Write an enzyme that holds these catalytic residues in place. Sequence first.
Site, PDB file in Angstrom:
ATOM      1  CB  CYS A  28      -0.904   0.018   1.233  1.00  0.00           C
ATOM      2  SG  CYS A  28      -2.439  -0.899   1.015  1.00  0.00           S
ATOM      3  CE  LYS A  51       2.437   5.273  -5.559  1.00  0.00           C
ATOM      4  NZ  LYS A  51       3.580   6.165  -5.346  1.00  0.00           N
ATOM      5  CG  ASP A  94       8.321  10.912   1.242  1.00  0.00           C
ATOM      6  OD1 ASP A  94       7.591  10.152   0.601  1.00  0.00           O
ATOM      7  OD2 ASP A  94       8.317  10.959   2.500  1.00  0.00           O
ATOM      8  N   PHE A 154      -1.412   6.610  -0.031  1.00  0.00           N
ATOM      9  CA  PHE A 154      -2.213   6.854  -1.229  1.00  0.00           C
ATOM     10  C   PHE A 154      -2.152   5.669  -2.202  1.00  0.00           C
ATOM     11  N   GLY A 155      -3.249   4.910  -2.258  1.00  0.00           N
ATOM     12  CA  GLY A 155      -3.427   3.829  -3.224  1.00  0.00           C
ATOM     13  C   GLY A 155      -2.839   2.480  -2.836  1.00  0.00           C
ATOM     14  CD  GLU A 156      -5.578  -1.947  -3.851  1.00  0.00           C
ATOM     15  OE1 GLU A 156      -5.226  -3.149  -3.801  1.00  0.00           O
ATOM     16  OE2 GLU A 156      -6.649  -1.560  -4.371  1.00  0.00           O
ATOM     17  CG  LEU A 157       3.245  -1.487  -5.768  1.00  0.00           C
ATOM     18  CD1 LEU A 157       3.388  -0.431  -6.886  1.00  0.00           C
ATOM     19  CD2 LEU A 157       4.569  -1.676  -5.018  1.00  0.00           C
TER      20      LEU A 157
END
EC number: 2.7.11.1
Length: 297
Positions: free
Chosen positions: A16, A35, A125, A17-20
């Site tokens: 896993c 993604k 990041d 913003f969103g899933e991989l």
Amino acid sequence: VLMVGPNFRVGKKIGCFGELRLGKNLYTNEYVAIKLEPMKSRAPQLHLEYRFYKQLGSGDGIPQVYYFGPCGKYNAMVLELLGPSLEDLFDLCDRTFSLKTVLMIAIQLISRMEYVHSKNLIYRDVKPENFLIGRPGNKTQQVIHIIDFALAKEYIDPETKKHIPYREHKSLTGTARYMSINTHLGKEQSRRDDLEALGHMFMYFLRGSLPWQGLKADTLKERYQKIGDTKRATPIEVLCENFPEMATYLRYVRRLDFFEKPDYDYLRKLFTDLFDRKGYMFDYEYDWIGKQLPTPV
Ligand SMILES: CC(C)[C@H](CO)Nc1nc(Nc2cccc(Cl)c2)c2ncn(C(C)C)c2n1
């Protein structure tokens, strides 16, 4: 069956913003990373990330991007599939890395960050989870890649062609454990901050932990402030006890002006001279070589 474009099959969730998702290019018999971001998302990030990847282009240790488009109820970005992260590998090595491993990592990541900066982007990041080796078995397993450009920013405004202005009261970007002291203070991030966060991460690897880890507060804001206070209260000489070159690196990057171009050559040479003095060979024999490496396929 979920497909992206004419040829990319979407497979199992690998993270896993969103899933991989694990994907496969059916036209070439190659596994890829996909993604996914829900089309319904409040605060979409995937299109912005794709634009940053395109701005970076083809660079050493930069994941290749193959496709962006709709996929059922998702927007999908199809990219090069990579191996485990530095955090994963750190866990595999009992949560310390040797000096040789940290320097091979550091030398490459100073270069990786110089490349990002050369494309007029700051990263914002830095964390061990965002640096991945290549797929165990393939020709790039040795290369430390940088991923996740959702938090990046153009530090040279293409409208003005000048460095972004200094300002404060910025919402805190990135992971509290690694972020620069000036990020804690709500200052606009610039090139210096990427390099300082790298420095914190290097010391994390070498020490096994940082002294501001596990600080708690009743709110997230107070917690960030305490971590920041501890970073400010911990002398570099103490944090980097036994690693003189790391103290030199950290002091240099902490003292950079907001607008200043880091001397990337100087910083690399701090570490390559050390590497040579210790008699290390840059042979990519990281601490994790010989261990059972996780794989996405
Ligand atoms: C989902 C996360 C745990 C990991 C590490 O941050 N992210 C991750 N893993 C990737 N691979 C991956 C995922 C789970 C296990 C293993 Cl061994 C590798 C990966 N490949 C390509 N990318 C980006 C360029 C999209 C990736 N990102």
